Structure 1
Amino acid sequence: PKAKTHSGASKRFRRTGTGKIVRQKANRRHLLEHKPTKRTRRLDGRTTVSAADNSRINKLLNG
């Protein structure tokens, strides 16, 4: 058999050119009014996943 790869994570996390796992920040989709532009800029981008859930995410991505 073949090891299936989790879709919900294969389409939510990425892999950089060295191995880091990055993710997009939440709380930025709707209700964007009353969120000061400072907060919105903070929430924009792609941050590396915390080492705590790094292993879980790695298992989910690799299968």
Structure 2
Amino acid sequence: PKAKTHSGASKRFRRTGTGKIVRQKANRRHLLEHKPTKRTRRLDGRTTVSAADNSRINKLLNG
């Protein structure tokens, strides 16, 4: 039985060239009128997964 990858984790996380798992940031989907553009710029782009969550996110991506 092949280890199935977690669909949600695969859709929410990516690995860079060096293997860094990257993710997008929450609170940037709607309710944006009250959010200053500095906040949305902070929430923009991709950030490396926190070391605490890295183990479980790797588990979900690999199997």
How would you bin the TM-score normalised by the shorter chain?
over 0.9
Q: Give, in whole Å, the separation in 2 of the partners of 1:45 and 1:8.
A: 19
SS at match of 1:9: helix
Instruction: Note the alpha carbon deviations across 1:10-46, whole angstroms, 9 max, x for none.
Output: 0000010110000000000000001001111011010
Query: What fraction of aligned residue pairs are identical, expressed as a percent?
Result: 100
Unaligned runs of 5+ in 1: none
Q: TM-score, normalised by structure 2?
A: 0.97
Query: What 5-or-longer segments of structure 2 have no aligned partner?
Result: none
Counterpart CA distance in 2 for 1:53 and 1:34 is: 30
Deviation at 1:56, TM superposition (A): 0.4
SS in 1 for 2:35: coil
Once residues 32 and 12 of structure 1 are traced to their aligned partners in structure 2, the CA distance between those partners, rounded to angstroms, is: 21
| Deviation of 1:48 (Å) | 0.1
Q: After TM superposition, where is structure 1 displaced by more than 3 Å over at least 4 residues in a row?
A: none
| Cα distance in 1 for residues equivalent to 2:29 and 2:62 | 28
**Count of aligned residue pairs for this structure pair:** 63
- Report the alpha carbon displacement of residue 2 of structure 1 after superposing the two structures with TM: 0.7
Q: Distance in 2 between matches of 1:4 and 1:37?
A: 39
